[PDB]
Design an enzyme around this catalytic site. Structure first.
Site, PDB file in Angstrom:
ATOM      1  N   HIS A   1      10.960   5.154  12.320  1.00 43.04           N
ATOM      2  CA  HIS A   1      10.767   3.962  11.401  1.00 43.04           C
ATOM      3  C   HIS A   1      11.223   3.888   9.806  1.00 43.04           C
ATOM      4  CE1 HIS A   1       6.671   6.194  10.314  1.00 43.04           C
ATOM      5  NE2 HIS A   1       7.259   5.550   9.190  1.00 43.04           N
TER       6      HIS A   1
ATOM      7  N   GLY B   1       4.428   6.940   2.028  1.00 46.29           N
ATOM      8  CA  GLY B   1       5.849   7.844   1.842  1.00 46.29           C
ATOM      9  C   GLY B   1       5.498   9.140   2.318  1.00 46.29           C
TER      10      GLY B   1
ATOM     11  N   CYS C   1       5.154   9.825   5.427  1.00 44.43           N
ATOM     12  CA  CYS C   1       5.587   9.877   6.915  1.00 44.43           C
ATOM     13  C   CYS C   1       6.863  10.978   6.776  1.00 44.43           C
ATOM     14  CB  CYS C   1       6.378   8.485   7.430  1.00 44.43           C
ATOM     15  SG  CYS C   1       5.079   7.310   7.187  1.00 44.43           S
TER      16      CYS C   1
HETATM   17  C1  LIG Z   1       5.781   6.471   5.672  1.00 44.90           C
HETATM   18  C2  LIG Z   1       5.342   5.154   6.297  1.00 44.90           C
HETATM   19  C3  LIG Z   1       3.924   4.698   5.697  1.00 44.90           C
HETATM   20  O1  LIG Z   1       3.692   4.750   4.606  1.00 44.90           O
HETATM   21  N1  LIG Z   1       3.290   3.485   6.687  1.00 44.90           N
HETATM   22  C4  LIG Z   1       3.960   3.001   7.528  1.00 44.90           C
HETATM   23  C5  LIG Z   1       4.069   3.253   9.155  1.00 44.90           C
HETATM   24  C6  LIG Z   1       4.905   2.298   9.281  1.00 44.90           C
HETATM   25  C7  LIG Z   1       5.185   1.807  10.873  1.00 44.90           C
HETATM   26  C8  LIG Z   1       6.579   0.965  10.892  1.00 44.90           C
HETATM   27  C9  LIG Z   1       4.195   0.993  11.426  1.00 44.90           C
HETATM   28  C10 LIG Z   1       5.074   3.114  11.756  1.00 44.90           C
HETATM   29  O2  LIG Z   1       4.934   1.416   8.400  1.00 44.90           O
HETATM   30  N2  LIG Z   1       4.375   1.714   7.187  1.00 44.90           N
HETATM   31  C11 LIG Z   1       1.837   3.635   6.138  1.00 44.90           C
HETATM   32  C12 LIG Z   1       0.839   2.826   7.521  1.00 44.90           C
HETATM   33  O3  LIG Z   1       1.092   3.312   8.724  1.00 44.90           O
HETATM   34  N3  LIG Z   1       0.464   1.894   7.122  1.00 44.90           N
HETATM   35  C13 LIG Z   1      -0.441   1.135   8.055  1.00 44.90           C
HETATM   36  C14 LIG Z   1      -1.609   1.011   7.978  1.00 44.90           C
HETATM   37  C15 LIG Z   1      -2.225   0.108   8.985  1.00 44.90           C
HETATM   38  C16 LIG Z   1      -1.453  -0.682   9.780  1.00 44.90           C
HETATM   39  O4  LIG Z   1      -2.479  -1.654  10.585  1.00 44.90           O
HETATM   40  C17 LIG Z   1      -2.049  -2.396  11.407  1.00 44.90           C
HETATM   41  C18 LIG Z   1      -0.280  -0.866   9.758  1.00 44.90           C
HETATM   42  C19 LIG Z   1       0.507   0.080   8.940  1.00 44.90           C
HETATM   43  C20 LIG Z   1       1.847  -0.034   8.833  1.00 44.90           C
HETATM   44  C21 LIG Z   1       1.153   4.854   6.023  1.00 44.90           C
HETATM   45  C22 LIG Z   1       0.243   4.656   4.870  1.00 44.90           C
HETATM   46  C23 LIG Z   1      -0.659   6.080   4.737  1.00 44.90           C
HETATM   47  C24 LIG Z   1      -0.377   7.025   5.519  1.00 44.90           C
HETATM   48  N4  LIG Z   1       0.361   6.960   6.406  1.00 44.90           N
HETATM   49  C25 LIG Z   1       1.055   6.080   6.703  1.00 44.90           C
END
Ligand SMILES: *CCC(=O)N(c1cc(C(C)(C)C)on1)[C@@H](C(=O)Nc1ccc(OC)cc1C)c1cccnc1
Ligand SMILES: *CCC(=O)N(c1cc(C(C)(C)C)on1)[C@@H](C(=O)Nc1ccc(OC)cc1C)c1cccnc1
Lengths: 304, 304
Positions: free
Chosen positions: A41, A143, A145
């Site tokens: 991603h 960030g 990830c």
């Molecule tokens: C490093 C990426 C990131 O911060 N996060 C993320 C992951 C993604 C996808 C493309 C969906 C894999 O996009 N942004 C977020 C995260 O997963 N946020 C998030 C929370 C809840 C929902 O509900 C639908 C969607 C998403 C995208 C993140 C934040 C904190 C910790 N880990 C990841």
């Protein structure tokens, strides 16, 4: 004595953390030999997250679009490929700090250490467990990830997890280093509810053994039980069923303490039925399930 | 999101761990520049522990009696001296892995990471707090002496603790890197009882703020209190008195959440008086006090 939620020393993994940037997205990558592994991603933008077609998004990317920085020096990307939900970026330089390593896919109930990173820089290390619903209760911000989960056996790092996402309930989902998600999760911003987070029974029993070894014995009772009787109680409390394999795995702890596994199950049964009554075990007011029987033996014996 | 008991990445400290052997005793040493620091009790035998005269025991030791091994290679000892309860062994080779460092003496309530070692080899890392009675609730077995506590600010390691002993109650005592014990403890096998282990109030409040930031808000109430009213309750529950300095230190967390410090004190007051009622906060059934307000901000912001 003393029992702590202990992580593996993180040095060997720190020397592998790099920053990967694609367009405006920057996340963490793992540099082993001449390959940098990161969540696929990284190629996604604001819109993309909702319904990404990774194969289509990847066509618009060339080697030069992946910026890999190790410390303050840039790595040259000479190849890129997608394996499941991870990208593998071939670089022209083998990581001189590559430790001996393996990629393992762990089972639920298994524990591991996470080195939480931001912009390829390590910020902290903590011990996790793969929950029975295939989520991890981590501490990850935007960030993070690309941060990885691992176990170490003397000098070999077994990487088992790479952070990919947070579910709307504040729990985390990720993949093994082959890019396969643990559980049914997908790398898209959609309704993904986690299943029942059941308690890892074998781990609770291992931690009750650790408590006895450390002098916390108040919960030991005059009762015994059977695997079938115990499991009726375990089901009632959303505890994972205990099998003969788990009893066998607890054998060394049973041997060291002289407390038969089924006797410890009866103590656990009374703790489930009566509660702690305001008491603590190993400094905790709840039954801890993120220590495996192997962790208890390793910590109680000082394996380096 | 998610809140974990997080340690600093341990790599910088792993590169400093050495094994020190004097006679039949082997413990851990810390190699910074051309000096190896270790507990002075490395010169003690079976009898000695009871009533050691370190100056007298040290007269019978020469540079060649201190065996220092870094990895699988031996370091040459060219000088030795005792500073309080630590020995400083001057070696002929500066540690090439010496990070930027400082020696700090922390106050009670302050937290730090410990890299538990055996035979100069790191086995695990966990986060501790200097208790108000100057003990630490660690996880240390025989041979762990010389393992160190530290904090990291970007690239500078501030060493604050060196493990020396376990009290009969299973709690731990040690020194700063100048050899001065934290608390009234001495390096001898004698009756040394710890004082009241009071709860670090400012840390509990910081962790209640971390819970609000992470969505656990059930404990927030419609009440407020004063520092004097709160402290009457805190004294009753063996909580450390809260001062205006602590209120000021909590300011950034109060600002981020919009919850005034005294309002959070009233929530803490009701939790003390009514208990958790079988509920949990940040996955814990008791009030956690081993996160400082600085730790909460660092973890919630992702400081690398
Ligand atoms: C490093 C990426 C990131 O911060 N996060 C993320 C992951 C993604 C996808 C493309 C969906 C894999 O996009 N942004 C977020 C995260 O997963 N946020 C998030 C929370 C809840 C929902 O509900 C639908 C969607 C998403 C995208 C993140 C934040 C904190 C910790 N880990 C990841
Ligand atoms: C590395 C040294 C060690 O294992 N321990 C130790 C410390 C000492 C002195 C010389 C007293 C500083 O001698 N052995 C022990 C330890 O402290 N054991 C211990 C427990 C209780 C009492 O009560 C009087 C005395 C002693 C000596 C150790 C064990 C586990 C963790 N840390 C240290």
């Amino acid at each position: 004595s003393g029992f702590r939620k202990m992580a593996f020393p993180s040095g060997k993994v720190e020397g592998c953390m790099v920053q990967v940037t694609c367009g405006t997205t920057t996340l963490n990558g793992l540099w082993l030999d001449d390959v940098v592994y990161c969540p696929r991603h990284v190629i996604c933008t604001s819109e993309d997250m909702l319904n990404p077609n990774y194969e289509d998004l990847l066509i618009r990317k060339s080697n030069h679009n992946f910026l890999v920085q190790a410390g303050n020096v840039q790595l040259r990307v000479i190849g890129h490929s997608m394996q499941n939900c991870v990208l593998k970026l071939k670089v022209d330089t083998a990581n001189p700090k590559t430790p001996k390593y393996k990629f393992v896919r762990i089972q639920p109930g298994q524990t591991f250490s996470v080195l939480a990173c931001y912009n390829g820089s390590p910020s902290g290390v903590y011990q996790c467990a793969m929950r029975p619903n295939f989520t991890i209760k981590g501490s990850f911000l935007n960030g993070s990830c690309g941060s990885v989960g691992f176990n170490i056996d003397y000098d070999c790092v077994s990487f088992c997890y790479m952070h990919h996402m947070e579910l709307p309930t504040g729990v985390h989902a990720g993949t093994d280093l082959e890019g396969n998600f643990y559980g049914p999760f997908v790398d898209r911003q959609t309704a993904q509810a986690a299943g029942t987070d059941t308690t890892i029974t074998v781990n609770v029993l291992a931690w009750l053994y650790a408590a006895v070894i450390n002098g916390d014995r108040w919960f030991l009772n005059r009762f015994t039980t059977t695997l079938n009787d115990f499991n009726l109680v375990a089901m009632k409390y959303n505890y994972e069923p205990l099998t003969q394999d788990h009893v066998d795995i607890l054998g060394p702890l049973s041997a060291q303490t002289g407390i038969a596994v089924l006797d410890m199950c009866a103590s656990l049964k009374e703790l489930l039925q009566n509660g702690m009554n305001g008491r603590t075990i190993l400094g905790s007011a709840l039954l801890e399930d993120e220590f495996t029987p192997f962790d208890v033996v390793r910590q109680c014996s000082g394996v380096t």
